[PDB]
Amino acid sequence: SGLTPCKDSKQFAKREKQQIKKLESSLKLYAPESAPALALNAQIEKTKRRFDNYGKYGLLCGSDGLPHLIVNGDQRHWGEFITPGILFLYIAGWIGWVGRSYLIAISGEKKPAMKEIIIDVPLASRIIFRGFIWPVAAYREFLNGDLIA
């Protein structure tokens, strides 16, 4: 959509050069072997590697020199939004399933409210491993009809 790749972005190169020039301005103030100078020299390399990696991944830059993210579902940009999205969904489902399974276990007690303050660690440690298979567990429970009260 009028976007150019990072590796061929003159404004991207200008941003990198300007940041490096600004960083090197403070390097001249200290002795070359001093600890502040050693710490500063490690910052320039980090900037260089970051810019190289951004160029190497085929990110798209506009007229500003800043990368843009395409989330329409293009197969060449699945790492921007699609790939991290499924990971977040899996992790959030794990957390939710563990939290839901803990409450059901203690609901049958005489005083279920007491277990919400003093957490039963031996009981909680067993349920934690069970969240690994939460997609299959939820898929099977939905079909059987036990998901909704």
Partner 1 sequence: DTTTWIWNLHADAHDFDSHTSDLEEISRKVFSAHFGQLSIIFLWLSGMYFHGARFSNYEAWLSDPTHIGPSAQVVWPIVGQEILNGDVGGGFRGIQITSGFFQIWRASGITSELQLYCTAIGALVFAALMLFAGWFHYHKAAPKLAWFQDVESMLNHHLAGLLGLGSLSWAGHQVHVSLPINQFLNAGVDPKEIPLPHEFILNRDLLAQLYPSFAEGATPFFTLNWSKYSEFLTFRGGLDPVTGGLWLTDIAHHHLAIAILFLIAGHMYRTNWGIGHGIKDILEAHKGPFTGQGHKGLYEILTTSWHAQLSLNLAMLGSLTIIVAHHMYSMPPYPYLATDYATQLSLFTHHMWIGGFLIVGAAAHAAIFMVRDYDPTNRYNDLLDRVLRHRDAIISHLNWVCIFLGFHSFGLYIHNDTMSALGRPQDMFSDTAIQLQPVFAQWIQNTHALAPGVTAPGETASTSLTWGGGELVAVGGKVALLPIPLGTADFLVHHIHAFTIHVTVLILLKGVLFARSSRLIPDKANLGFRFPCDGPGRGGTCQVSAWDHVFLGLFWMYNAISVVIFHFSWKMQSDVWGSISDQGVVTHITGGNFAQSSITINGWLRDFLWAQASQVIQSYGSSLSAYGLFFLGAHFVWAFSLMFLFSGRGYWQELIESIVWAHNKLKVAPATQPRALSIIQGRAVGVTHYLLGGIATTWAFFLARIIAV
Partner 2 sequence: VMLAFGTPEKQILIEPIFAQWIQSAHGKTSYGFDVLLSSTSGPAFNAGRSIWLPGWLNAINENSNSLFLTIGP
Partner 3 sequence: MRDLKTYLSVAPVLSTLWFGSLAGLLIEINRLFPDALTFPF
How many CA within 13 A on the CB side of residue 109? 13
Contact in structure between 100 and 134 (CB atoms under 8 Å): no
Q: Residue 124 binds what, of partner 2, partner 1, ligand CLA, none (CB under 5 to 8 Å, by partner type)?
A: ligand CLA
Looking at beta carbons only, is 51 or 97 nearer to partner 2? 51
Q: Is 67 among the residues that bind partner 3 (CB under 8 A)?
A: yes
Helices 82-106, 134-144: axis angle to 10 degrees equals 60
Q: Is 96 among the residues that bind ligand CLA (CB under 6 A)?
A: yes
Of residues 36-55, those binding partner 3 (CB under 8 A): 46, 49-50, 53-54
How many whole angstroms separate alpha carbon 87 and alpha carbon 109? 35
Task: Please report where in the chains the tokens 């939290």 appear, as a residue.
Answer: 99
Binding map of ligand CLA across residues 57-86, x = CB under 6 A, - = no contact: --------------x----------x--xx
Contact in structure between 3 and 68 (CB atoms under 8 Å): yes
Give the footprint of ligand CLA on this chain (CB under 6 A).
71, 82, 85-86, 96, 98-100, 102, 119, 124
